[model samples]
Target: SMSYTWTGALITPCAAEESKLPINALSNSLLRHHNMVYATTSRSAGLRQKKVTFDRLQVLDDHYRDVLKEMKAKASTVKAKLLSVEEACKLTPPHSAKSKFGYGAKDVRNLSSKAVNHIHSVWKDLLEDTVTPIDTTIMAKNEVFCVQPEKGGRKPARLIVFPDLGVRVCEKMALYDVVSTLPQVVMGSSYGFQYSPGQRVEFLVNTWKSKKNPMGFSYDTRCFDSTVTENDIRVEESIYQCCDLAPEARQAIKSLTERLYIGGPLTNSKGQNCGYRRCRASGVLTTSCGNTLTCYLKASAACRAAKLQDCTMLVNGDDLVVICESAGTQEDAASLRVFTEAMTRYSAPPGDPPQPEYDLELITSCSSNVSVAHDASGKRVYYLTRDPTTPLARAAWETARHTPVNSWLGNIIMYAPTLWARMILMTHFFSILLAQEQLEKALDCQIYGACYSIEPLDLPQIIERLHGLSAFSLHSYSPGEINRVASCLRKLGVPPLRVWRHRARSVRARLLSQGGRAATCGKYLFNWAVKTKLKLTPIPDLSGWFVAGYSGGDIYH
Candidate 1:
């Protein structure tokens, strides 16, 4: 079946769009190669549409059914609750899209009588109609990125297909608890979203070291969302049905599965009929859960078909990393080929063919890999890190513009212990905030698709809570990690590490002079910049962070 059937209607932008990187005074200070950084706009969405639209063919075997059975057994032990209208309304993000039927996110959040009344009706409608295809808005996502020469100069905007705000709220009412709770229970340790950055690296490292001869590879599904079949969505719903849910919740889930999850009519921002989508909707409450389950099922079955031994998988949504025992070089290579063949038969073909990697650091999953760094006591520690190219590019864009979600803050929180994140991202952003005297202002950032309002001044405490005191004092980074950062700096035309150190010293001094929380930030976060670093102490209050993965769950904290 075709993933999409188009009607030649253009994906129009709602407002003015910027394709080029906007240059400002602060932009040149962070990145000299402004031309290398560009933002994707609606103009390039046509190319993206061409790329994503394709026919899918799926052939499931006994192995796939066997794995699905095992997953279902684990899922049956769980019970999920139906969120009340008020609870569901509170989950909506403040800036979420408005509904065609009157009212907005603000009205929903405040539990306004009209919004609450409409939500009840929407829920009622879901229970009554299980066959009617729901309507979804199709829009091109405006995102910032660095140009890759080999992959062409610039990439096109990614399409985001989502239902109306009313339906979105109803989705939370029906399946928020299920999506958040089911993945962890069924997938167990293999569920990637359950682990924090430090925990993730630890799990990967421990899994690698446990194997006598570890061979790992990351499987990249080509357009994973588009690869999803109607059968796959139904299979996901069956697994969800295994959960002990309220009768109303059960009816709503079943109806949502048949109506919205399987496929939907695509409406443009201008309220024109764009097309129809049969593939996975990128913006939905169940997207993360569904993708994780489908990926794990397909990959697990593929592993059996290839006769791989002692396979330990870490799956986050569609990102999969498998660490398993090797069966010799030639045999392992042949086995991966068979695995690829099996996955292709299951309709989840690879964008880049999977290759068996002997080294853990070389295998990247979830756009991150394990890297070694030493704590203050010279004890080796494993931490998750990724190429700073995109982070730096987006940081540069955020510096000049006022965006809703601050990726830099999210990066800092998630990759707190990484050298580039600590040295460059912190120093550069804090300097700008200090100059503007906005360090105390809370800014919105996302972690696992959940919006969080974080203050720059509270970073020291946040890092302590999330990553621990070791994040502040970690040093002696691996040569491979250091080289990657250095090369990225050179490629992005970013100032050298030493120059950042000099700037950090100035920022640290300014922050220390502010006193209170700013002084604490200077003392803890910028300790690495000083010749004789302060003995970083544990923060007293640590709570309300690192709870659960809320990707596409419309969660805000």
Candidate 2:
């Protein structure tokens, strides 16, 4: 079943063309309509004949201006300092991708080998050359299918910006703070991961209805960073320039912008030096920062161009969700088309087409949609979710070494209350981790490539923050969703929710007997299993001290 992992590409496994077994009829029935997988050229093909310019026509309203002010406030708070080579080395995860230079992450981290010297040389080169674009490696991003598709099961190629261990350290020094804090500042509550599914839905509902004629939709760019032109890169640089920096830090940022952020050459795994790129590189320190700023800039400009009222947006990298005032239904469609036109002219067109949702929960951003189900006590429950394809592929990759993104962990944190996450993902991974006795080990996982230390026990607090106490009691999922969950369980060779319930009972007993942190874990993670629920406690609120939001956090405290 896990045969597709060894091709060496970091990609999520998808349903093979030959895999048409109808074991779960309801799941098959639900999935039958979702045939078309992914396409690129289709969206970018059409363009406005008249060249679009960003400088003159773009208007930053009070909202946009206010957000930028907040970002500047945060950016100003960042002190300019570079980590020592040893400090940086100490930060690298053992499970990080091995360098093509024949040194593993462990070798680089130990600083006892020649890998350190090579890393030093790379950092020196970055310091020396401010004009030359650094080369990047390209590989397929292993990701789950947002929807269950009929044919192709593949992840898109991601341009690896800093393959050299040293340069990545330098890259982090130059742009890490900007990437971590800027989007959250500018996007505010619209920053996707700031809220759990319930909070997100609440925000969306309130924001959507705040206007008398509220109209909201999500805009997905076609290869967003790839479509980022040289000019767009410069515009992003201009935004970064708004920040105050130390002399060396400013120079380093400029150098990084030239070398990696703007564009570089793509080298494939087979040692093929593909072509040079002038667009935004997918795997860079500034990728998230660049895309969020770029998308916000463009979308903000587009909203003004379309004359949509009370524009509010939530942007995570290239994914965008906009809530605005509607001009009547027919007029709203016309206005949306105009908005797309403006976006197309801005070089950030929709991937397929922009979807307008009268229902806030229906709009999908960051590939997640909100859905409702019933819990054990027959109370209504809501969760942010998509299909299980990506999570399953990610689970398979957990069995493999080195994932580009910790999709499984992120889903677990975000969708802990969901049927798919709890019944399948938690059971499967925890079962494996328990067997290997790695439950206590702080293994490296990433949300958007920023490092995080994942322990099996932290699952409870993480779940608590995202879903509230209700996470423990959720059950009786929507029939369609549950059928798919069952199908996914069989497909992934994971235990069903029933089995998880049994395991939960056992785990609950063990943890309670063990005491301390184990007792806490039992109370939080296995609370649903026991006849009586444990009194829920608040997880520590350390967001102020740490890099908060999504996978933007660091591993070490």
What is the model-wide C-alpha lDDT for candidate 1?
A: 0.91
lDDT of each: 0.91, 0.61
Q: Model 2 RMSD to the real structure?
A: 7.9
Sequence-dependent TM-score of model 2: 0.75
> Model 1 residue 104 lDDT?
95
- For 1-557, candidate 1 gives per-residue lDDT tens digits of 99999999999899999877887888889999988999999898899999899999999999999999999999999999999999988888898888888999999999989988888898999999999999988989899999999888889999998888899999998898999899988999999988888888889989999999999999999999999999999999999999999999999999999999999999888889989999999988999899999999999999999999999999988999999999999999999999999999999999999999999999999899888889999998888899999999999899899898999999999999999999999999999998899998999999877898888888888888778899999999999999999999999999999999999999999999999889898889899999987777786554545555667667876
Error of 2 at 287 (Å): 0.6
lDDT minimum window of 10 residues, candidate 1: 539-548
The prediction achieving the highest TM-score against the true structure is: 1
lDDT value for model 2: 0.61
Angstrom error at residue 13, model 2: 17
